[PDB]
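Dear colleague,

Following up on Tuesday's group meeting, I ran the structure prediction for the four-component complex that the binding team flagged. I've pasted the input sequences exactly as they went in, so you can double-check that nothing got truncated or mislabelled along the way. The structure tokens for the whole assembly follow below. Feel free to forward this to whoever is handling the docking comparison.

Inputs:
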Amino acid sequence: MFTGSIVAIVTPMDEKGNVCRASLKKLIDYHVASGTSAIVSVGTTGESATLNHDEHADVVMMTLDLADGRIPVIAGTGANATAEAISLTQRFNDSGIVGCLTVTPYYNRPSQEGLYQHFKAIAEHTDLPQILFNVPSRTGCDLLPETVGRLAKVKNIIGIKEATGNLTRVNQIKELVSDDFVLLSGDDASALDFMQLGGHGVISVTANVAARDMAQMCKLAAEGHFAEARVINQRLMPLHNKLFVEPNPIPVKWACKELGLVATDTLRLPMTPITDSGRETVRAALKHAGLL
Amino acid sequence: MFTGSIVAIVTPMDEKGNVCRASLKKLIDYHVASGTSAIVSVGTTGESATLNHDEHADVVMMTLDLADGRIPVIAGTGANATAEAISLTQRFNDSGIVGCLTVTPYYNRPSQEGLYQHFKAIAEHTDLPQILFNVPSRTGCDLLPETVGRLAKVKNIIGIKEATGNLTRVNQIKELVSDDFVLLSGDDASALDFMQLGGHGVISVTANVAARDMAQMCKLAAEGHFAEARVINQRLMPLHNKLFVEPNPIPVKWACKELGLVATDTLRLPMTPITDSGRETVRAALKHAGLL
Amino acid sequence: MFTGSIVAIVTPMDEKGNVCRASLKKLIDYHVASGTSAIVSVGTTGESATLNHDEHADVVMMTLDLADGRIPVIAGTGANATAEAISLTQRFNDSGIVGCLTVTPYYNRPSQEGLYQHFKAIAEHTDLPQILFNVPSRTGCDLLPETVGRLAKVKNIIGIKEATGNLTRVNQIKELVSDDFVLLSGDDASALDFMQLGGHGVISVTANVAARDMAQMCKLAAEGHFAEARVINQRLMPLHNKLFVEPNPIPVKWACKELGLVATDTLRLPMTPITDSGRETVRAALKHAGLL
Amino acid sequence: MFTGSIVAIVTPMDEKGNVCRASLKKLIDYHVASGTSAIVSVGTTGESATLNHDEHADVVMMTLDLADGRIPVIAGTGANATAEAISLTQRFNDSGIVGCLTVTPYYNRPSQEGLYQHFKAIAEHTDLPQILFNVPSRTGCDLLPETVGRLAKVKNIIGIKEATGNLTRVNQIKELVSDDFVLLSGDDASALDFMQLGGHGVISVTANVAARDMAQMCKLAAEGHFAEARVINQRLMPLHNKLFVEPNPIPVKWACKELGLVATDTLRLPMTPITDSGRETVRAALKHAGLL
């Protein structure tokens, strides 16, 4: 499933930074019960940056196992070297995942033509559906709509997570691609606007802690009841902003811990513990959402 | 040596995309003869992003052996995961490299406190001199002068490659650190200005193909003879700019091949072959510089 | 009328730069026949910058006279000194205009509190409805939603022309103001998106030359037929962009001349004649729109 | 004189918002005694935006008479309409001012060709020396070095006040113009760096309240004694920054009043009184500078 509220799930860790199975199970049970459409495992919010490919794979397999068919799982598979992205993708073939979320190469700043060849080659060497992921603030490059349109012609490139926060992109992309190509927001604070403009859902950080509200908001939005959805969004808006008051996923892991959904808020360096000021900002956002 | 013209050297490759030993030797001899003060091996211009850590270590060791004590070699050791940066740094402990060039974590956007804990841990796991590297347009994050001052108090952290193109940083950093701390431009087009403000040199892309002029420009600059250094800078300014007409190192590798310095201009995806129009652009800038 | 397609009308000039009555009449007849909701007289596209207050007033009175009750007229009245904005506003009291379009002070970069006091004082000393105008790219300041919300409580501040091109502003403002406060796009290329998000119309440069299409697009948008409206918008999109290929109103005045709607494309300095390249770009956009 | 520390002088006002003659005389005496090289009368810091042209001419003439041949006076003559800039310039022909400081048209965003025709026409209607003024954050447009080179060939255009804060412009402009062409910082915080790169001085806001230190800093800089100039710059750096904590000239006028240099800190709307928090911020920076 590539529609509705999709959680960009945290990788819960113990005090030594290793995946905590008991916390992860609890989160998955929570998403099943709360009506989340799918789980992105080991994307950016899941600390893909600081797990090696072995641990990355373990977490995705553990997520599949615990999910036990009750909720679809999409694996993060992005890399800034095309050969590495292919290799990582091969690790998940015939695993049970329903798709992959794959980011524009970060740091090395390829051209549009380079981005096109990068994703075409990934797509060629798998049967798994691919969701492109654009986030220039993190990567230093910007997959423009024209190039998205070229890539949408590839059979198994089926959608895009668009995280510019630039809402003009929704209809620039939409007019260049087929009606079943999926447009997903990657920016929680502008996500309802994104859907109102024609987007089909959101890959969401807020959904980690407000899963039920997020699920209802996205369904109301898909039904065209945008005013009914804005009431919920307005409740969630302090969360949409303050979950990024310190680098993601520091705030959301703290929030998960405060709610009792995970055992510890431990991250891996270069992420560092939440400051006390961040604590009180996030706690106030959780209260505004009605979660504490 | 952490002063004068330091080349951010390309990793020349055969048509298969693997390191070409004869081309690399030719490049190193060229830098020895040209007066280049040091080599950065497998930094960004050397395609650190598309080489695995074993391949990257093989290229550093091969560059060191080929230099044969004639020119100091600095290893690129950057990673966006701290444990991974330590691990890569440790491959070079007691190897003969004189120091490491280590970038701010890219993509995961750490806070200033995160940047501090990252570089500090790295420095504590090595005896090698560490040069910080700040390049916000590639990384999505910006190591501010205040934090550079903090890290400069670590015995082992001895300078910064500053690639913002924002020349105010030279004296903001200088007043916060000791006189022994080295300040290096990471932006060829503004590097002479950077030295005129008190910078000690440049880690240069232009130097790959104009090593003699670059060495002489930096020597004049260190001596305070700025007007004569500008005459060289003006010859070189089209290269400073046009070597980024397409994503680096696509232009510089083609220019190396055109000058007979390397056998092929092959790169790894997501870098792609230079376009015809970029070919003509770089040819004209080489001509302007008097090289072709 | 402050809803639908509102033309930011050109001030047609003869060869000496003086208002051309015959061309202006033709334009007004054209807007009456084409279903334009209203005319903004002597706003930015009408060269408010280069007419003095006497000429400014003459053009607005001439526009009223020629309009002859058939179409409502809104006068541009903005100034970067509060006392000048008041004085200019007093010139139009009891003139027949239905409202004023008043820009954030440009150049002097006041604070939010300053912007609040600026517009409150203007509003206090007239009965005429006021439409706030935010356009940071031109002014160097940005009237934020919070401050719009404070100003909306003033009886006769009735709406805003929002020209950031940042579509998140629509619902940020809307939730802070009453349901009859009017939200108008000031950015043609993102205007349909703006209306789809809840905006009530557009103060438009494209409407100078594609009035009928613009009127229909805005009505379809108000009725919720967004797909039907996008077909028209897609026809107009090259115009929405290329009318700004050179500084507005240079392209649109040329376009008006090519269509025969005005006698000359003359502007006042520092606007200069369209280049030949601009000519062919704009002509191609007019053809794509089906106007030539 | 178009060299050294040139003050962008406030227009001190009584509580009614009109020019206060006793405060202005006190300021001019202060600059004569302090070693300030020249006064810019009714530039931006002098509230050119909120004074009509008659009031602005009255203040320039009063500043000239009070200077009584002891210190050269430069008139601000900027306007975004070319005919208006000419008219204002002509008020000062044969008046005793030594030159004009004239800004790129703000708000109407002319092309580079427009900027060329604007400044050229102005220069042709006067015998007075003209200093160009580029400040893109206020004006919405950017006079590039290439165009500065073009205008410098006009006999009458003799320098530029560069307020981008982008220090690369110093040598981009310098290589395109003759050695007689003057380069002046318009950004106090980067002005010493600007002079170290070959700049000839600064038109300064800081100098309003720290005229002695500024004159001495610029004198040391012209002599090449940069390290000793930095010691002064560091004393002054909190002012360089905090004098813009609220929109200029709100902070500098309050600081003038606190030092007993003017009778009131009154400004014209849309500038508003300094906040309590800004009061405390500016007080601390004055203390740091050793003035209070």
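The interface with chain A takes residues 165, 167-168, 170-171, 175, 189-190, 192-193, 196-197, 230, 234 of chain C (CB under 8 Å).

Cheers,
M.
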